[PDB]
Design an enzyme around this catalytic site. Structure first.
Site, mmCIF file in Angstrom:
data_model
loop_
_atom_site.group_PDB
_atom_site.id
_atom_site.type_symbol
_atom_site.label_atom_id
_atom_site.label_comp_id
_atom_site.label_asym_id
_atom_site.label_seq_id
_atom_site.Cartn_x
_atom_site.Cartn_y
_atom_site.Cartn_z
ATOM 1 N N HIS A 134 0.801 -1.217 0.000
ATOM 2 C CA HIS A 134 0.000 0.000 0.000
ATOM 3 C C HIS A 134 0.834 1.267 0.000
ATOM 4 O O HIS A 134 0.289 2.346 -0.269
ATOM 5 C CB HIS A 134 -0.928 0.044 1.222
ATOM 6 N N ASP A 264 -4.242 -12.817 4.342
ATOM 7 C CA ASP A 264 -5.521 -12.433 4.926
ATOM 8 C C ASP A 264 -6.712 -12.892 4.078
ATOM 9 O O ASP A 264 -7.858 -12.613 4.454
ATOM 10 C CB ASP A 264 -5.589 -10.909 5.221
HETATM 11 C C1 LIG Z 1 -7.268 0.023 14.248
HETATM 12 N N1 LIG Z 1 -7.847 -1.351 14.311
HETATM 13 C C2 LIG Z 1 -9.351 -1.245 14.220
HETATM 14 C C3 LIG Z 1 -7.297 -2.222 13.212
HETATM 15 C C4 LIG Z 1 -7.866 -1.859 11.859
HETATM 16 C C5 LIG Z 1 -8.945 -2.539 11.283
HETATM 17 C C6 LIG Z 1 -9.466 -2.176 10.033
HETATM 18 C C7 LIG Z 1 -9.002 -1.094 9.282
HETATM 19 S S1 LIG Z 1 -9.568 -0.653 7.727
HETATM 20 O O1 LIG Z 1 -10.594 -1.515 7.276
HETATM 21 O O2 LIG Z 1 -9.731 0.738 7.560
HETATM 22 N N2 LIG Z 1 -8.105 -1.090 6.958
HETATM 23 C C8 LIG Z 1 -7.001 -0.234 6.640
HETATM 24 C C9 LIG Z 1 -5.968 -0.979 6.083
HETATM 25 C C10 LIG Z 1 -6.373 -2.363 6.083
HETATM 26 C C11 LIG Z 1 -5.608 -3.465 5.576
HETATM 27 C C12 LIG Z 1 -4.281 -3.626 5.530
HETATM 28 C C13 LIG Z 1 -3.755 -4.832 4.939
HETATM 29 O O3 LIG Z 1 -3.915 -5.963 5.436
HETATM 30 N N3 LIG Z 1 -3.056 -4.939 3.738
HETATM 31 O O4 LIG Z 1 -2.658 -6.190 3.354
HETATM 32 C C14 LIG Z 1 -7.638 -2.395 6.618
HETATM 33 C C15 LIG Z 1 -7.911 -0.462 9.885
HETATM 34 C C16 LIG Z 1 -7.375 -0.803 11.118
HETATM 35 ZN ZN LIG Z 2 -4.154 -7.248 3.250
#
Ligand SMILES: CN(C)Cc1ccc(S(=O)(=O)n2ccc(/C=C/C(=O)NO)c2)cc1
Ligand SMILES: [Zn+2]
Ligand SMILES: N[C@@H](Cc1ccccc1)C(=O)O
Ligand SMILES: [K+]
Ligand SMILES: [K+]
Length: 358
Positions: A134, A264
């Protein structure tokens, strides 16, 4: 000469979220992977490859000088300054050791690329964090600071005179950072399969749809496969690889394959919502070995169920080592939703790839 390289260093565990003890991107991700690789006897069958820090010039293949300087400065910040800066980006945290670990995370991939392109190893896997897919030219994003595989692709082109790199991103999220970096570049083919749900799944970008095929000189060299239903299974991925990704890969004739190897999408992940068995990744990895003389480097991206991610890594590793393709628990047919997505992506990429014109 015929070995599988593995990179892991303790620095990969020396950063974590100071203000959220339950943050999913955490040191236990990689230590659990390493423990299972050992208990399964796979670690001892690998060639240990040392990590190294990426150089400034290597980072500048992808990132801006301003951004690199800002990230370099986080190693001296107070926790309050780290939080203030982290909140200027979408979904990241910072930590005094983040920059140091991020530089070793990029460097671990470059080290494997060196061995694979010089025929000292057949293939390799870096068990690295932080993840990269990302990260963007001038910003952090989605738990990522530097774009590990985008840097590695440009490094392979500059250092090893590679003409064509294939990047396969099977993390459940769209690696929009990789897409952006190579959007106009026909020398790096980016393929991403990811949960989308009409944009309701993060990162909520229309550019994650299959209509984004690249632009300018890069048209046809960006391939998005968006899922619009949760619960996808091994059969959905196997079908997509057999009838979309691998036909294009053989037509593109890459000289190196880099995998954004997130897990994931595996059964049990708390973020991904999919139902892919870890054994599926043995099969997907096998398919990719037929291209580019098997010059294949996997690098860990996401995957936040400690056991599921370890199992996915192990399944991929068995294939890199050349173990027999395993029988699959559920060798079911793909679902209607997956077939709709695959058909639509094929439709969008049809003008650019003869191997899709069936
Ligand atoms: C802070 N606590 C709640 C954890 C959290 C849960 C969900 C979200 S989210 O849905 O906004 N989000 C942003 C990035 C990703 C994935 C990253 C990835 O795995 N790339 O491989 C998912 C953010 C944070
Ligand atoms: Zn991911
Ligand atoms: N290749 C056939 C059928 C087809 C259509 C669209 C996509 C894929 C296949 C025509 O052209
Ligand atoms: K992906
Ligand atoms: K591209």
């Amino acid at each position: 000469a015929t070995g599988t390289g593995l990179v892991y260093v303790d620095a990969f565990t020396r950063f974590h979220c100071l203000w959220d003890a339950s943050h999913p991107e955490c040191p236990a991700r990689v230590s659990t992977v390493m423990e299972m690789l050992e208990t399964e006897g796979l670690l001892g069958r690998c060639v240990q490859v040392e990590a190294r820090a990426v150089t400034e010039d290597e980072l500048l293949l992808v990132h801006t000088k301003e951004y690199v300087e800002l990230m370099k400065s986080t190693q001296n910040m107070t926790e309050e300054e780290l939080k203030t800066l982290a909140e200027k980006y979408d979904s990241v945290y910072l930590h005094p050791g983040f920059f140091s670990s991020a530089c070793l995370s990029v460097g671990s991939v470059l080290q494997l690329v060196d061995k694979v392109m010089t025929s000292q190893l057949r293939n390799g896997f870096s068990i690295n964090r932080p993840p990269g897919h990302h990260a963007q030219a001038d910003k952090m994003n989605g738990f990522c600071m530097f774009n590990n595989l985008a840097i590695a692709a440009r490094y392979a082109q500059k250092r090893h005179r590679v003409q064509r790199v294939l990047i396969v991103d099977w993390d459940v999220h769209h690696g929009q950072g990789i897409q952006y970096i190579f959007e106009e570049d026909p020398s790096v083919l980016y393929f991403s399969v990811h949960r989308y749900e009409d944009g309701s799944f993060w990162p909520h970008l229309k550019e994650s749809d299959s209509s984004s095929v690249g632009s300018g000189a890069g048209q046809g060299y960006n391939i998005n496969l968006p899922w619009n239903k949760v619960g996808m299974e091994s059969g959905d991925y196997i079908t997509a690889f057999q009838q979309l990704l691998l036909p294009v890969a053989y037509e593109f004739q890459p000289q190196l394959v880099l995998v954004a190897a997130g897990f994931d999408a595996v059964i049990g992940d708390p973020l991904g919502g999919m139902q892919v068995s870890p054994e599926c990744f043995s099969i997907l990895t096998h398919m990719l070995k037929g291209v580019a003389q098997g010059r294949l480097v996997l690098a860990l991206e996401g995957g936040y169920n400690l056991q599921s991610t370890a199992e996915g890594v192990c399944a991929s590793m068995r294939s890199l080592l050349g173990d027999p393709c395993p029988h699959l628990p559920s060798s079911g047919a793909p679902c209607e939703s997956a077939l709709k997505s695959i058909s639509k992506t094929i439709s969008d990429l049809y003008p650019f790839w003869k191997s899709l014109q069936t």
